[PDB]
Amino acid sequence: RFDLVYLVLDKVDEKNDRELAKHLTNLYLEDKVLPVEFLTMYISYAKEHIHPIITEAAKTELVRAYVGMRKMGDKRITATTRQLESMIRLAEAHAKMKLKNVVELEDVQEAVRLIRSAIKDYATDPKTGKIDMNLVQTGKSVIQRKLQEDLSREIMNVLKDSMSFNELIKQINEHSQDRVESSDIQEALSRLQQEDKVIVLGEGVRRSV
Amino acid sequence: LVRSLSPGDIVDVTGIFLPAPYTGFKALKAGLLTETYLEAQFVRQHKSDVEERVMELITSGDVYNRLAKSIAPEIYGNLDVKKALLLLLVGGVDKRVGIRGDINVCLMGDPGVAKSQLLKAICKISPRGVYTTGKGTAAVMKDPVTDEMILEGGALVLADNGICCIDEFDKMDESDRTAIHEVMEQQTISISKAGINTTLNARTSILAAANPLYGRYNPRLSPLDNINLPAALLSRFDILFLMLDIPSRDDDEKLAEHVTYVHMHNKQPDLDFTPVEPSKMREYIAYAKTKRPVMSEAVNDYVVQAYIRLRQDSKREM
Ligand SMILES: Nc1ncnc2c1ncn2[C@@H]1O[C@H](COP(=O)(O)OP(=O)(O)OP(O)(O)=S)[C@@H](O)[C@H]1O
Ligand SMILES: [Mg+2]
């Protein structure tokens, strides 16, 4: 739901740390042009007097920006219409600031740069735009989709019958694959139940119809 | 005599013991059973020469190694913990903000180690010092129905210009967690009983004595895993000591001899200089508080390279 989510990190490196700590020591030595207070009313003046209006060149630039973001990766799903509407918001805010009341072209790519940098920050290295919208990422979703079919085939060859959870763990985490997490197997069992491929008989055994 | 008595007093009040009568209607209601009060007449409390004396002690006794052993003479070992407790007792002064001059230390320790004894020793010598446990701070409003008083204090406000010895720090609930968090980076506790949003000044130095869960400390396990304290709260502590006991062959023997001698003679086995009076620390804080030792520029340099190399080794270790 957040338009811009900045991942403020303090990763270690001596090059940056030297400057940061020198600037901090400046603060220690400080105590023993900037509108410091004019801005708190300048913001109100811009919020009241200025009513930004977006124009056709800005419209074309925005549509283009969104289509471009999406195609950056199109199987996966990069940006979403909520992000499009948020950009409609950052451009309007940038026009509100500087007191121009018109969303010119420049504000559009300024907001696009901000949005793109934010996405590049808070998404994984192959920027997904879906992990933020869903804990189940594709690199994770493949795990459940493999486990469900492995469970189907496993139970089939067994009947070739059924068992509770412990026995199912015995032939999955041991030799079928690596030491995978246990709850993922019963999670894929839920999808199998929805597909009606297998039936779970209470806490104990579980077979297939 | 008004305003000569306060709740933190032990006094020998002299007065005329008089039968206050229930004059009115509850008078006939009750009868001959009178109520009494003491019309107080005289209150006797019980509870640069000192500067010269403490200066001479500085000349003679080595404060760094003497006051440390003086804090807990009956507690054997853990000298560096006592040295840190001296720093907490004195504390730096950095009131100017842009910060704080309160030193906070936590002793994760181990069950069976005399952390509580150290806390009590600090409480009994530190002015405005209080001792409390996690399970039985905060505040309560309008405790008596009749008088209907407003904004009664707690445990942190009492040690305003002092130290709070929070024993059993791990076993302390979320409400007190938030309260001590507010106190620690605000030096002022507040309440929101009826939208009043009143606040109480509690600039208390925090001395915690949390102990590992599941009994004895596990050195193999990570320190924050051994004690149920969030890293956010622990990381804000100025200095932290993990001081657990190890079964040895000689330390235990000396400890047993010390404790048994205390039991025989009702006095510590005096083997070194053991100052008793706490007024020396009060003189030191009152003296250098106005002085406010100004840091040197070379000091600032050496500490900036100190931070650089500290962060470098922190990375290279991880
Ligand atoms: N170094 C020491 N010198 C003298 N007495 C000690 C020492 N260490 C422990 N004791 C004795 O241990 C007792 C106090 O230990 P505690 O501080 O209660 O241990 P503890 O770790 O606080 O236990 P808890 O409640 O699990 S935190 C007293 O009988 C002390 O005499
Ligand atoms: Mg104890």
Side-chain angles (χ1 to χ4, degrees), chain A residues 1-22 24-29 31-126 128-204 207-209, chain B residues 1-24 26-51 53-55 57-65 67-89 91-95 97-101 103-266 268-280 282-283 285-288 290-318:
Chain A
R1 284 320 185 284
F2 295 96
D3 308 335
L4 307 153
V5 36
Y6 300 127
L7 227 175
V8 24
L9 265 221
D10 325 324
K11 61 180 180 295
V12 57
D13 73 283
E14 310 313 308
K15 180 258 291 180
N16 193 11
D17 173 73
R18 201 261 179 194
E19 294 179 353
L20 290 182
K22 185 63 67 182
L24 288 196
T25 49
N26 297 332
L27 286 179
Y28 293 101
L29 299 148
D31 67 323
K32 269 176 281 297
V33 60
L34 290 94
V36 291
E37 190 275 331
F38 165 73
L39 80 166
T40 192
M41 71 195 108
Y42 167 56
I43 294 165
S44 68
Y45 303 142
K47 193 177 294 296
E48 295 179 355
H49 312 131
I50 296 305
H51 281 96
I53 289 155
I54 183 168
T55 73
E56 292 84 349
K59 162 184 172 180
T60 63
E61 186 46 54
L62 272 166
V63 171
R64 221 251 11 269
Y66 177 56
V67 307
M69 234 161 332
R70 300 194 64 80
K71 272 107 246 161
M72 177 225 318
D74 149 75
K75 199 230 4 261
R76 215 165 62 234
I77 153 64
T78 337
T80 56
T81 314
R82 342 204 4 94
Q83 266 68 293
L84 193 161
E85 300 227 12
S86 77
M87 294 168 347
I88 294 237
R89 298 208 282 271
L90 283 172
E92 290 189 355
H94 209 275
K96 193 178 267 151
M97 171 215 67
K98 291 161 69 176
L99 267 64
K100 65 174 73 59
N101 71 71
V102 170
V103 181
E104 48 162 342
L105 194 141
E106 190 273 331
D107 283 344
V108 179
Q109 70 272 16
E110 207 279 326
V112 168
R113 185 252 317 169
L114 289 173
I115 289 280
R116 195 175 167 279
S117 82
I119 296 172
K120 212 177 311 297
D121 294 330
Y122 89 104
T124 186
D125 192 84
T128 306
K130 189 59 70 69
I131 175 63
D132 49 353
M133 270 155 178
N134 170 31
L135 176 69
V136 180
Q137 196 267 330
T138 308
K140 316 287 194 204
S141 77
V142 290
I143 315 169
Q144 293 82 17
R145 78 192 59 218
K146 286 185 291 276
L147 268 295
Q148 49 101 24
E149 53 93 21
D150 194 10
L151 273 169
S152 232
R153 243 53 91 256
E154 189 263 20
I155 271 202
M156 294 169 197
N157 319 314
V158 166
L159 151 79
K160 280 164 216 4
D161 280 23
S162 143
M163 69 296 264
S164 187
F165 292 165
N166 302 321
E167 307 90 308
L168 267 183
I169 303 291
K170 297 306 154 303
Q171 290 97 24
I172 290 287
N173 287 36
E174 268 78 356
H175 53 102
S176 298
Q177 213 48 55
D178 48 347
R179 188 49 73 106
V180 297
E181 198 273 331
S182 60
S183 307
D184 305 340
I185 291 148
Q186 51 94 53
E187 200 266 354
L189 278 178
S190 88
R191 298 307 107 203
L192 284 174
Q193 283 174 171
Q194 295 316 304
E195 205 83 355
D196 304 329
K197 305 298 304 292
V198 298
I199 62 186
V200 164
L201 282 69
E203 190 268 332
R207 211 188 53 258
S208 177
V209 63
Chain B
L1 273 179
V2 193
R3 262 172 302 251
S4 52
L5 291 169
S6 66
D9 291 331
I10 288 187
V11 291
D12 280 12
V13 163
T14 294
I16 322 173
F17 184 74
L18 286 187
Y22 287 135
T23 178
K26 178 77 172 198
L28 296 161
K29 195 279 166 84
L32 315 172
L33 204 70
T34 71
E35 199 198 0
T36 59
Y37 72 102
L38 183 73
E39 183 91 20
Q41 306 281 64
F42 171 78
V43 163
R44 176 200 315 282
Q45 305 273 341
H46 264 295
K47 297 179 292 291
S48 174
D49 52 323
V50 300
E51 184 272 307
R53 186 179 66 247
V54 301
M55 182 56 257
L57 302 177
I58 283 168
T59 67
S60 62
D62 46 352
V63 60
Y64 275 44
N65 202 19
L67 267 293
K69 322 197 181 101
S70 161
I71 300 311
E74 71 270 16
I75 306 305
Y76 182 75
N78 304 317
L79 275 297
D80 199 1
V81 172
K82 302 182 189 183
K83 294 188 200 46
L85 290 195
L86 273 296
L87 302 195
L88 186 149
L89 265 168
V93 55
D94 207 359
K95 176 183 151 50
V97 290
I99 297 102
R100 297 204 191 284
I103 294 178
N104 291 336
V105 65
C106 166
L107 323 175
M108 281 145 88
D110 210 8
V113 184
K115 309 156 304 206
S116 303
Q117 312 312 295
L118 281 152
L119 259 66
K120 270 190 280 290
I122 287 292
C123 170
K124 297 303 163 274
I125 68 189
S126 162
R128 317 270 324 151
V130 68
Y131 170 83
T132 186
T133 71
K135 48 190 188 300
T137 76
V140 285
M141 291 56 68
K142 322 184 294 181
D143 300 335
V145 175
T146 60
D147 59 10
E148 199 262 325
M149 61 79 71
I150 299 177
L151 198 50
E152 207 273 326
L156 295 163
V157 302
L158 289 182
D160 207 358
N161 289 297
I163 308 154
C164 196
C165 309
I166 304 98
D167 198 352
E168 296 286 337
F169 191 82
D170 51 326
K171 294 188 86 61
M172 171 213 67
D173 62 344
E174 310 297 328
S175 160
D176 295 348
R177 273 185 211 264
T178 51
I180 191 166
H181 199 215
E182 168 187 1
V183 168
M184 184 177 177
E185 67 260 11
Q186 197 184 346
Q187 303 289 98
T188 313
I189 187 167
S190 172
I191 69 164
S192 293
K193 182 253 295 179
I196 47 180
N197 310 109
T198 185
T199 197
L200 296 86
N201 51 331
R203 42 198 68 97
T204 301
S205 301
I206 302 312
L207 164 74
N211 47 2
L213 59 84
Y214 292 167
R216 302 195 65 253
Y217 186 87
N218 188 6
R220 310 294 97 184
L221 216 55
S222 194
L224 73 165
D225 208 350
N226 273 291
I227 297 89
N228 51 319
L229 266 297
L233 183 55
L234 291 196
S235 312
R236 297 198 44 82
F237 268 110
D238 300 326
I239 184 163
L240 188 149
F241 273 98
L242 164 71
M243 60 80 71
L244 73 165
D245 68 322
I246 297 96
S248 70
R249 299 290 328 189
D250 203 6
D251 310 328
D252 305 85
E253 213 276 338
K254 298 178 269 182
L255 172 58
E257 291 175 346
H258 193 129
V259 172
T260 49
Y261 196 97
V262 174
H263 273 253
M264 293 183 286
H265 298 89
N266 295 278
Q268 290 78 9
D270 287 358
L271 300 175
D272 207 4
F273 178 43
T274 44
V276 175
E277 52 88 20
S279 78
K280 193 269 181 183
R282 179 182 180 273
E283 198 281 314
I285 177 169
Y287 165 79
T290 63
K291 300 292 183 182
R292 191 177 176 87
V294 63
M295 65 182 179
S296 179
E297 169 68 21
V299 166
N300 291 109
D301 291 331
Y302 194 92
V303 302
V304 67
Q305 292 83 18
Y307 189 44
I308 287 147
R309 64 177 179 266
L310 271 155
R311 189 175 179 177
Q312 182 36 67
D313 64 60
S314 315
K315 168 38 59 184
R316 79 163 65 102
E317 201 187 10
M318 286 146 193

